[PDB]
Amino acid sequence: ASPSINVALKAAFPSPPYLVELLETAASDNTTIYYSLLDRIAKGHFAEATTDKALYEKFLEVLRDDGHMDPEALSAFKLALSLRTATPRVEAHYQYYTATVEPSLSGTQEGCDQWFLIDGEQYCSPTLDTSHGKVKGEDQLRTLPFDRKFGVGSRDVILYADITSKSFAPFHEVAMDLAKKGKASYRVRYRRSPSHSRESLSVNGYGVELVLKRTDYIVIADIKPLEKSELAALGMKAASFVMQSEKPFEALLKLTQDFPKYSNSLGSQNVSAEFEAEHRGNREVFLPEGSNVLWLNGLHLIDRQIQPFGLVDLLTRERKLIKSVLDLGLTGQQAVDLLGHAEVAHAKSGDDEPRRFDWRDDIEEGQVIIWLNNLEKDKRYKSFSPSIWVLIHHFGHGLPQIRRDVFNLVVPVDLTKADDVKIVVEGLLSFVKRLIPVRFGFVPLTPTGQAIDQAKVVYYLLENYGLAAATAYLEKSYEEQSTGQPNERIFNEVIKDKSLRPDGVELSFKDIFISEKHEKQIHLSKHWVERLRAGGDVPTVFFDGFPIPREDNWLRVMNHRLMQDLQALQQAGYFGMLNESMWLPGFFLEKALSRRNTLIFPEDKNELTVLNVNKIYIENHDLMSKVPVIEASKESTRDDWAALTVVADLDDIEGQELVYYALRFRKSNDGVRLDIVHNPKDTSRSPSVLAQRLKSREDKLLDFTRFLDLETALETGEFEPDVAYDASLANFLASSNMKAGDNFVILNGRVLGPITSADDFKKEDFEVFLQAERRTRILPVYKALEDLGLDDKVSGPLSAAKLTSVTALSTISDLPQGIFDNAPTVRTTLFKQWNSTYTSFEVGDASTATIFFVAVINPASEIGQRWVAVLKVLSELEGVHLRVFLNPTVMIEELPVKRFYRYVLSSSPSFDESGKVKALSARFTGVPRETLLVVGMDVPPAWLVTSKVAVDDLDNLRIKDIKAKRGTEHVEAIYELEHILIEGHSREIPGAHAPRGVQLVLETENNPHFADTIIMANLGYFQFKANPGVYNIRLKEGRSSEIFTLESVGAKGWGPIPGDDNTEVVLMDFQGTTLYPRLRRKPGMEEEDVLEPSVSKTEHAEINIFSVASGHLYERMLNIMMASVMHHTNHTVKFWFIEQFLSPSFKDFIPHMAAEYGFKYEMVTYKWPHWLRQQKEKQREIWGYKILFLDVLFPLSLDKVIFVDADQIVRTDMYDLVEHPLDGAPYGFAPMCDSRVEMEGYRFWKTGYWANYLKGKPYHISALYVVDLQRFRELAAGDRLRQQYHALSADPNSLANLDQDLPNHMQFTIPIATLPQEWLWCETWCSDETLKDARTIDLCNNPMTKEPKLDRARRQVPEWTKYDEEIAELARRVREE
């Protein structure tokens, strides 16, 4: 009975058969569930269910009966099935099939509904006797994202099937059995089934908004009744209403959806209830008032992640993690509590800190470092104070002089190399002479004969008294040509000054063989260099235990840490942490490690891979119950416990050397539990044999002394290859990121590798690896775990590893830090402090729940409207707990909620009277008749949406008008999910920077030019508009491919994850595709694309004009604008439109305008980037579209474009604007009229701000402008517009009209070609005498009038009606056609 508004969304691809959709939804990523169900339907088991409901009903019984899903997983299945999450995954198959299979399968297909593909040969029969073809094109055997494999087999077999028919069942069984035997590996690909209809897909998981477009009025339903200054209490009174209500969750939803309507209805019946002002004790401690914050098991979620799809993927990932933990008898509550524990988060913060290594001589008994200083005893520094306050009282960029030991620098030098020697002589000594407060040491490098000798020479001379003498040899040797070999001619003169007085020393060129000098000194030195990996092609310098490689201005690097260390000391001093009797260098050495490994301590701190240990022993039980295992000792302590697994190629010296070290390390550490996985490069000989050789010798392996005993044990014994072991072996490596013949080391789930050389990982390297790993991951788990009293659950080394490994996985970055939010992956428990009695309500059983949600919603917020709606539906799921906190603000200067909101989502599928799946829609009932409303779509980030069906003006909705024009109080509108985004964040390799101005091309096997875009400066951002299918990204041929080669598109993650050296993208989800591509510069390039070392016309048109209209009137005016151009030019014109702001009525009309006026048209759009600052106000969005995305909105093939406003009319042949010289400027604009005499008052660009800023430059008009696009992109103007906009936009009152104001603010930075004013006329600011020579007319809003735009047009232009009549009769001609 009530006046209603209904909005629905449909996808750009037809609905896949329900059967296949349930198969896919059901088996998310578990293959066993997939083929176990594929058997069931090939029985013909699912043939007897006639309707979708019955079919759905059948799946529930099956899954429950076969043990596939438990209540928790079943509930999750229903929600994912409502969401229709599997539909794009199925469409990926079809698009792949349509575009790569059919054109590479030459011949005549009839009866070949299904067909296996074997060795590039097609077989239409199960009996496999005859083969139709040699399939053309690239290999289809490439394993791609949507593939499934069943079994391991030398041969690879693919079946392209239409499951729907019964013709499928025998083909399946042929290859299912063939795989069950082990002849070949089986996989299913889909074929679009013609039994099913080509009806489009009805989607859900989006939001609809009805925005009040008139907010200006402030002091069943007709119009909202407003309110005076009492705004301040809205949030507060709104929060109370709910608390009081009795069924609070429902209230919030009912209140929050129709909130603008209930504003005046608040403040009634002794409303405030001031008990809830008690809990600002909880605002005093943690979050600011009116802020929306969501947590999922401690994880703080960003707004983008708060949609149904984003949330389904998070549960899926989270449950996998927790379930792993709760097989050790922990409740979901206990598991989460452990993950977010204080001791755990402390460790992440702990090793976010920079790493230092112990540079001391202590281990090598003080005989390796030859210091050029001592600050406590050098009689250079005698003058200086040895006081702590000297440090603390130092400001500036310098360094305080002090007689104390505080800063140290040890530099390893090769005495053969001139450049290396030069460092000590010039570099190091100057610093000494200069009285720098840094102690300087150096240790010689011994990698060649001559080097060994020269270390001996210098070292020995020093050891047993010589100082200045050794220095002297070095200096003389360096200056005296270039000595990279000992020179006696030079050496002998140095000795001539007989300063060798302090206690007897040997003399001559006998390069000493003294067991003390040659052996101890040189071997001790080598032990220091090896220990800290301080040698090689690139040696390593240690400043305060901080490794700085000896490359390009390392002293610049040193100075940076020198200042950073000094500031670190000062802070401790002002807090009185420091005292006078202290060794200051040991403030840094507190956490320093004795040994240094680049694998354990990579310089890229993020580089970390951890595997779920429970998973490893669950998936590969067949493998891991038959690997040689050294159990960790019976009588060792929990603190000692650790689990180690070594993966190695025992058919290589490095592979077996690595294992010998691991075995050696095990003898020493009784607590470790060792596993050996033999991973061979060549699988001609079964891997099971060598594993079987060792497990027999398992008792006897740890009981030995020599390497050959291990070598010999590998050779001896006769064994039967367990091919079942071999299968689980190759599955393990595939699941883990591991190649064949590659060496890896796994301690408590953490993987290091591949190990290229076994000298990289020695016995001493395992010891530090355990020491470091122990610290971070094991000790924080142990403490935290014990604090909760769950320390009964640890029963051994393998038992422990399950927990430590899981908690390490919980804190993994992906989504990468610095992209969506800078904040680290730390699970807070910080809201547990909050009192809950009067602001919170919970839904779900906390005792059973695996998912714990903590929502902090401000009822007065518009963001809250969506949050409540989504959370209600996720709250309905079994095994989920939710707790809500309401936190309003007292700061309400403007109206809080200015829209109505509906979320299209269900927790389980709904069925028809005919049993078909119910489509979902947003229905607003009892809409006020007199309020002007705007329809908006609040769609997931990867989606691009436009109106398809609507007869109404969605930008100007009023029920009274529709009733008085259409006769109906009921409105229906249908949208189309036209595109889904492929978006990514680029980087250059190895010196990672965003490659800006790089051009990209998206392609498919059908067409090599799907789309094109250019790389942005901000996060190396780029995007493509696409739908489900298999694509490829090639750098655009030209300057881009000249400078770069892209190794990869980051489809696996930030990585590099091995196996991702690919350029293939596929989208099979409603979340699109997120990519992290990598591009490495070609041989010796410091080049830039942006600077140099009839095409567009042919492709498009002579003239390219683009525009936007946001209403039926403005669209009607746009029709006139296009016509005026056409009458005024006999040239070829192409029109470009901003697709999403236009009505379907307009959209359905243009082909008819194009036939009549003879122009070409193209619809364009771009999705507003996530990083780029949003516009809550639609009019402002539109303005942003005209200026911010000029370089990326139009295809690269377009040389230039012209913007003409909708209300405009043109009397000129528009080419002239193209031919207009821009004198090296990217875009051209027309200025504001000065000609009108008496208008001055309203000319605001002659005021202080605009006249001070625009020193001499004009105040330009955004109604008309030219963009020399080739130059625009070449100058990279867009990036500058975007970052200045983002920076300026922080202030809300910054840009009144951004479109005009941005080019004006940027005309100093970016040239603006100024146009002849013959190019623009407006009555408001130009005289009537001016219009004779006027080229085009804008209808600028007169502010001294209220005469409407329709009136100005008829009065101002007499030919306006002539244009309108033409359109009017044509519209009727079409309607009567």
Ligand SMILES: *[C@@H]1O[C@H](CO)[C@@H](O[C@@H]2O[C@H](CO)[C@@H](O[C@@H]3O[C@H](CO)[C@@H](O)[C@H](O[C@H]4O[C@H](CO[C@H]5O[C@H](CO[C@H]6O[C@H](CO)[C@@H](O)[C@H](O)[C@@H]6O)[C@@H](O)[C@H](O[C@H]6O[C@H](CO)[C@@H](O)[C@H](O)[C@@H]6O)[C@@H]5O)[C@@H](O)[C@H](O)[C@@H]4O)[C@@H]3O)[C@H](O)[C@H]2NC(C)=O)[C@H](O)[C@H]1NC(C)=O
């Ligand atoms: C776009 O599309 C079309 C086709 O491609 C075309 O559009 C033209 O636009 C004009 C308006 O700009 C149309 O109107 C005519 O404009 C002229 C003014 O130039 C008017 O005089 C004319 O009225 C009468 O005369 C027409 C023909 O007379 C003209 O002839 C001379 C032009 O040169 C050609 O002459 C003949 C063809 O006639 C040919 O053999 C030659 O090789 C030349 O190519 C010119 O010297 C004339 O001027 C004298 O005479 C007039 C009186 O006629 C007098 O007033 C003058 O003082 C002078 O002594 C004269 O212009 C005739 O066709 C009309 O029917 C009418 O009787 C129109 O109002 C025009 O119809 C139209 N077509 C052409 C081909 O011109 C353009 O090619 C395209 N335009 C753009 C912008 O892209």
Ligand SMILES: *[C@@H]1O[C@H](CO)[C@@H](O[C@@H]2O[C@H](CO)[C@@H](O[C@@H]3O[C@H](CO[C@H]4O[C@H](CO[C@H]5O[C@H](CO)[C@@H](O)[C@H](O)[C@@H]5O)[C@@H](O)[C@H](O)[C@@H]4O)[C@@H](O)[C@H](O[C@H]4O[C@H](CO)[C@@H](O)[C@H](O[C@H]5O[C@H](CO)[C@@H](O)[C@H](O)[C@@H]5O)[C@@H]4O)[C@@H]3O)[C@H](O)[C@H]2NC(C)=O)[C@H](O)[C@H]1NC(C)=O
């Ligand atoms: C000035 O600068 C100094 C130097 O930088 C700073 O001094 C102290 O720095 C410590 C941090 O490194 C803080 O810890 C305190 O230590 C003292 C003494 O150290 C004890 O432990 C040592 C550890 O031994 C191991 O390691 C060394 C190598 O590092 C190795 O050689 C050993 O073999 C061994 O493996 C011992 O070497 C040392 O002999 C001594 O035992 C300690 O007294 C502090 O303890 C306080 O708190 C505990 C409870 O946490 C309490 O039990 C203590 O009671 C004492 O008194 C009763 C009754 O007489 C007696 O029964 C006990 O046996 C205790 O002796 C005591 O109240 C603490 O652990 C320390 O904070 C820090 N400063 C102070 C003031 O303590 C510091 O900046 C300044 N200190 C001074 C005094 O100048």
Ligand SMILES: *[C@@H]1O[C@H](CO)[C@@H](O[C@@H]2O[C@H](CO)[C@@H](O[C@@H]3O[C@H](CO)[C@@H](O)[C@H](O[C@H]4O[C@H](CO[C@H]5O[C@H](CO)[C@@H](O)[C@H](O)[C@@H]5O)[C@@H](O)[C@H](O)[C@@H]4O)[C@@H]3O)[C@H](O)[C@H]2NC(C)=O)[C@H](O)[C@H]1NC(C)=O
């Ligand atoms: C992909 O999907 C498949 C199928 O949906 C999943 O595979 C399932 O995994 C189950 C894992 O537990 C497995 O259960 C096994 O059942 C046998 C027979 O009872 C047990 O011998 C196995 O050993 C494990 O558990 C026992 C003790 O548990 C049993 O007894 C208690 C009562 O005392 C019962 O509560 C319990 O349910 C078990 O019956 C231990 O002693 C062993 O040491 C060992 O840990 C397994 O429990 C299923 O057979 C298997 N298939 C099906 C149809 O459910 C697969 O997990 C999934 N993968 C992913 C990634 O989720």
Ligand SMILES: *[C@@H]1O[C@H](CO)[C@@H](O[C@@H]2O[C@H](CO)[C@@H](O[C@@H]3O[C@H](CO[C@H]4O[C@H](CO)[C@@H](O)[C@H](O)[C@@H]4O)[C@@H](O)[C@H](O[C@H]4O[C@H](CO)[C@@H](O)[C@H](O)[C@@H]4O)[C@@H]3O)[C@H](O)[C@H]2NC(C)=O)[C@H](O)[C@H]1NC(C)=O
């Ligand atoms: C969540 O909800 C709880 C509900 O209990 C709030 O707790 C209140 O906390 C305040 C501040 O601590 C309490 O007020 C004070 O209590 C003192 C007694 O407790 C102290 O001593 C015990 C040991 O005996 C300690 O364990 C404890 O930590 C306290 O230190 C009184 O001595 C205080 O009196 C002082 O102030 C008054 C008023 O100015 C003077 O007249 C006195 O002479 C004296 O100087 C004081 O009363 C309060 O009792 C607690 N309860 C309530 C209902 O408020 C949490 O604050 C709240 N947290 C959040 C984040 O919202």
Ligand SMILES: [Ca+2]
């Ligand atoms: Ca205008």
Ligand SMILES: [Pt+2]
């Ligand atoms: Pt400095």
Ligand SMILES: [Pt+2]
């Ligand atoms: Pt401090």
Ligand SMILES: [Pt+2]
């Ligand atoms: Pt991003």
